[PDB]
């Protein structure tokens, strides 16, 4: 029960500098065994390839399919995940397999360099992180598994506004993918960090934190309570009243900023639309009526300089009550 395939390796020991071409261009053939486990079979082909890959840090991706093989069960035992695979074989063609580094090992090298680098090194790395996630979404689950989020927060909270803004653009890259999204829904500390970020003096950083928080509340509604609880914990830990950061943006110490003001009102709006409970609702709206909200709303709805879109979403506010 043997199998004849086309093999290629991928040099990805360093994830911040991955090469693009797998060598050789013309994949060589060798014969395996479909009913025996792959781990013991990896060395013959590893020497067949002469790869500069730590054989004990290696992993296997099915080329067209993308599947990561469990390295110590046979080919017949994971048949249910190789449907397209045996059909290429059944066509009488030879399917192709990519030798690369485990997502675990790659995310581990990443967490090292994030935790151990600094200055220009660290900065370069964060910029490339964005594109890396765009082009291998598969790293994202292993990433959530290795507390990479712990790393990101543990780095961002002691860094400057550029370092943090780059972190946040990267973070939006994570959240376009389902697994990273799930990691953010799980990590209360993360959303807490983004709320801290809404008090930054960088108005770019505030806009960005605000728009990603919009992405967060638009994905689902199950995370509206999680948001409100995180905000309460941050305001309570910092010594400030809950929600003070938004309303400070609303009553502008620096002046007018329509895009931020409209972003904020839509955010709170879209926080409002997701709860049938009127009682915690009333709890919260008292907490807000305390801080002075009605006069701010009133006097701003007065001035005709307000932009029309901002105005529409704030009348959605008033219409709610």
């Amino acid at each position: 029960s043997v199998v004849t395939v086309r093999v290629q390796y991928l040099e990805d020991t360093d994830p911040f500098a991955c090469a693009n071409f797998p060598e050789p261009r013309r994949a060589p053939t060798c014969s395996l065994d479909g009913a025996l486990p792959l781990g013991a079979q990896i060395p013959a082909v590893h020497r067949l390839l002469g790869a500069p890959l730590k054989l004990e840090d290696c992993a296997l991706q099915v080329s067209p399919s993308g599947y990561y093989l469990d390295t110590e069960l046979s080919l017949e035992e994971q048949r249910e995940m190789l449907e397209g695979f045996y059909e290429e074989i059944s066509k009488g063609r030879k399917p192709t397999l990519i030798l690369r580094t485990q997502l675990s090992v790659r995310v581990n090298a990443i967490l090292e360099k994030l935790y151990s680098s600094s200055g220009p090194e660290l900065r370069r790395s964060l910029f490339s992180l964005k594109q890396i996630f765009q082009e291998d979404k598969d790293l994202v689950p292993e990433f959530v598994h290795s507390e990479g989020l712990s790393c990101l927060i543990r780095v961002g909270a002691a860094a400057d506004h550029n370092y943090q803004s780059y972190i946040l653009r990267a973070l939006g890259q994570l959240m376009l993918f389902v697994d990273g999204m799930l990691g953010v829904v799980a990590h209360s500390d993360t959303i807490q960090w983004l709320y801290t970020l809404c008090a930054s003096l960088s108005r770019l950083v505030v806009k960005t934190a605000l728009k990603l928080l919009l992405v967060f509340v638009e994905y689902s509604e199950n995370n509206a309570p999680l948001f409100i609880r995180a905000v309460n914990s941050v305001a309570s830990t910092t010594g400030a009243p809950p929600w003070a950061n938004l309303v400070s943006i609303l009553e502008e110490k620096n002046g007018a900023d329509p895009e931020l003001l409209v972003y904020t009102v839509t955010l709170i709006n879209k926080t409002l639309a997701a709860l049938p409970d009127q009682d915690s609702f009333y709890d919260v709206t008292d907490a807000l009526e305390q801080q002075g909200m009605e006069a701010l709303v009133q006097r701003h709805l007065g001035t005709a300089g307000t932009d029309v879109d901002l105005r529409t979403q704030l009348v959605l506010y008033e219409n709610a009550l």
Partner: protein, 118 residues
């Protein structure tokens, strides 16, 4: 048998047209880059104008930003092929990172400095 000579020599051929390709692309790259550097610039109408002007500097910035990341995509899959060269690439990547951030927060200042006019 004589073909394997033809083969290695084709390897040298393919690498020669390879970086001749890199060079012709880079031509346009240089023009764009030059312009990037160029757009720089260290009354109340004036401050406002500046925020509205730096706003078009950046409307143009993100406009070119799409082929700019086409540039970052091309460079990464560029150094995939091919000691001396590496530093060169790093040098332009760091220089462009510094001016990427630099015009980012220079237009930000110009917006947020007619904010001191508004």
């Amino acid at each position: 048998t004589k073909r394997l000579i033809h083969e290695n020599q084709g390897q040298c051929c393919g690498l020669i047209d390879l970086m001749r390709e890199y060079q012709n692309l880079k031509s346009a790259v240089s023009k764009v880059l030059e312009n990037a550097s160029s757009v720089i610039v260290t009354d109340q109408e004036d401050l406002k104008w500046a925020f509205s002007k730096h706003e078009t500097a950046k409307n143009k910035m993100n406009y070119k930003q799409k082929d700019l990341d086409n540039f970052t995509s091309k460079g990464k899959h560029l150094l995939s092929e091919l000691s001396l060269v590496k530093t060169d690439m790093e040098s332009t990547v760091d220089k462009w990172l510094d001016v990427s951030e630099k015009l980012e927060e220079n237009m930000d200042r110009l917006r947020v400095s007619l904010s001191i006019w508004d």
